């Protein structure tokens, strides 16, 4: 199946963390079919594209732990 | 150090369970192939051999009724499934009307 | 230039390429044991007593090699290490010897080139 999370591109101490749209039967840092948005830990840079989200979640995509919390930190996912 | 009691990681455990899943699926697939061949021998010889006076059930369409019930009971299990179970019914239904007296 | 329509028919492409010194599968250095350590005379402009030794490589080939510097200690059972460079004064010799490695000793009392010839630092 397909799910939402974050990969790894930046090695060592600087863990930048990538975008997402990947299968569970694939790799930790491999092939990604579509792009969305990411966040940087030791910075104020928080993207997360909203029109890409909810459009991918309607067709069997599972929202797992890491894509969450950073979702509610922004103005998306609330009682609206 | 070694443990006080005896233990051995049985690789034959995953083989015995695989042989148990086979003996059930093989017996139901071999049934669907032997019952089908018994029907194909009735369609070949054109069996209009009537002997029953109570029910005028013809021997060429009698075994075909047992064949229909033999194919769909295999669709329940992991032996045969969709599209293939419809193809085994489509070919047997084609030769019963082709090799028949009008 | 050879015409454009003949370039589709024939199509110009180079060769399989010949090597200057066959040191196997792209290996920089190769090991081997010396069979015969002899002395040979140079070409037409030079006249000296140059020391050359026939090295039996790890592949099975027995090619000649030149020994640099003044004085050596290579015997009939010495395990040497070759370099790969021509001298162009002695015919047949396409290899050089790296001194200061394995059984091959370095040149004594040499103060100039210590990177090559395999000499240590004098205190």
């Amino acid at each position: 199946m397909v799910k939402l999370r974050l990969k790894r591109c930046g090695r060592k101490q600087r863990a930048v963390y990538r975008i997402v749209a990947i299968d569970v039967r694939s790799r930790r840092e491999g092939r990604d079919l579509q792009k969305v948005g990411f966040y940087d830990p030791i910075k104020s840079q928080t993207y997360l594209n909203v029109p890409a989200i909810l459009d991918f979640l309607e067709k069997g995509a599972q929202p797992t732990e890491t894509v969450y919390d950073i979702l509610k930190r922004a103005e998306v996912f609330k009682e609206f | 150090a070694a443990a006080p009691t005896k233990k051995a990681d049985s690789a034959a455990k995953r083989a015995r369970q695989a042989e148990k899943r086979r003996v059930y699926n093989k017996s139901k697939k071999s049934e669907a192939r032997t019952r089908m061949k018994k029907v194909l021998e009735a369609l070949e010889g054109l069996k209009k051999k009537t002997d029953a006076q109570a029910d005028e059930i013809v021997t060429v369409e009698k075994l075909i009724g047992e064949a229909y019930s033999a194919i769909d009971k295999a669709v329940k299990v992991k032996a045969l499934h969709k599209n293939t179970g419809a193809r085994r019914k489509s070919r047997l239904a084609r030769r019963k009307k082709a090799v028949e007296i009008h | 230039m050879p015409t454009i329509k003949q370039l589709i028919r024939n199509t110009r492409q180079p060769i399989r390429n010949v090597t200057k010194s066959p040191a196997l599968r792209g290996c920089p250095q190769r090991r081997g044991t010396c069979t015969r350590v002899y002395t040979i005379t140079p070409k037409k402009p030079n006249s000296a007593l140059r020391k050359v030794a026939r090295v039996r490589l790890t592949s099975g080939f027995e090619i000649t090699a030149y020994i640099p510097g003044i004085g050596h200690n290579l015997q009939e059972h010495s395990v040497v290490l070759v370099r790969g460079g021509r001298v162009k004064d002695l015919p047949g010799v396409r290899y050089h010897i790296v001194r200061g490695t394995l059984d091959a000793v370095g040149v004594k009392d040499r103060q100039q080139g210590r990177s090559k010839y395999g000499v240590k630092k004098p205190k």
Binding site: - | - | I4, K5, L7, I8
Partner: protein, 83 residues
């Protein structure tokens, strides 16, 4: 689906016609036109199209492993060598 035109060279086969498609295309490294010719085994169940006819081939359901194309229309008649 893709459509390619060509002339029929061989007709001595049961319900199958050998269509030779000529295609002119410029070389990306050079500049001039390089002509490539590959023959396709088309399907003809009505055996109407004989040798010398120029027909157009469309993509369809594979009737065999070599055959995958069918001959639907006809633009011109016989354009072959005289007997």
């Amino acid at each position: 689906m893709k459509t390619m035109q060509g002339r029929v060279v061989c007709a001595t086969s049961d319900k199958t016609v050998a269509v030779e498609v000529v295609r002119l295309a410029p070389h990306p490294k050079y500049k001039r036109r390089v002509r490539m010719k590959k023959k396709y085994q088309a399907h003809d169940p009505d055996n109407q199209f004989k040798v010398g006819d120029v027909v157009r081939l469309e993509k369809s359901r594979p009737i065999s492993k070599t055959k995958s194309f069918v001959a639907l229309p006809v633009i011109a008649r016989a354009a072959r060598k005289a007997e």
